[PDB]
Amino acid sequence: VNSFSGYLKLTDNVYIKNADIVEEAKKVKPTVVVNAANVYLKHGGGVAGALNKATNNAMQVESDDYIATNGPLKVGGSCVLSGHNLAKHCLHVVGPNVNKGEDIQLLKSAYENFNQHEVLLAPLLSAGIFGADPIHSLRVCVDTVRTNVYLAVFDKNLYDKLVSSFL
Numbered sequence: 169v170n171s172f173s174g175y176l177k178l179t180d181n182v183y184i185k186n187a188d189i190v191e192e193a194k195k196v197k198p199t200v201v202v203n204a205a206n207v208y209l210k211h212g213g214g215v216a217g218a219l220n221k222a223t224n225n226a227m228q229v230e231s232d233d234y235i236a237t238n239g240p241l242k243v244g245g246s247c248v249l250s251g252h253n254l255a256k257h258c259l260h261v262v263g264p265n266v267n268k269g270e271d272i273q274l275l276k277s278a279y280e281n282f283n284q285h286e287v288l289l290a291p292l293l294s295a296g297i298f299g300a301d302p303i304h305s306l307r308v309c310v311d312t313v314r315t316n317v318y319l320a321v322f323d324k325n326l327y328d329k330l331v332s333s334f335l
């Protein structure tokens with residue numbers, strides 16, 4: 169038993185809710201919140217900009233030190249950093265950005281990072297400003313992630329469509 173509430177169950181291990189991931193994180197304090205990161209951990213907009221804003225820019229400060237030490241992530245890769253006031257940990261995961269021409273097949277590799285964590289609160293990778301089809305992203309999530317994932321979908325209209333079209 170865990171503290172996530174109001175989710176619809178899609179599969180044995182995947183759940184989905186119309187929710188702002190920032191507010192969901194603030195209420196649940198999950199062990200892991202996933203950020204829709206880029207390779208530079210520049211949290212300017214989309215989910216990353218919102219999460220970072222909610223940490224009063226502490227996520228960005230920590231991220232800049234991470235990059236200065238380690239260099240950029242790989243597309244499809246991830247790193248574990250602090251969750252600040254939102255979660256114990258933040259798993260920064262880089263899905264491919266279609267608006268940069270990145271290979272959508274890397275989306276499966278991106279979701280594989282979730283399997284290193286037993287339970288996660290997450291957005292749909294490569295959705296929103298990353299330019300992928302959220303329905304495809306949901307399919308890859310379901311077919312790749314084996315751990316328990318709670319997907320927060322900010323837009324009520326997209327949420328309804330994702331549910332209604334789910335196979």
Ligand SMILES: C[C@@]1(C(=O)O)CCN(C(=O)Cc2c[nH]c3nccc(Cl)c23)C1
Nearest residue numbers: 204213214215216295296297321322323
């Ligand atoms: C539309 C979403 C939802 O409704 O759940 C799915 C994808 N998403 C993002 O925020 C993805 C994202 C990461 N960096 C960004 N920078 C600027 C704008 C966006 Cl969209 C993003 C929210």
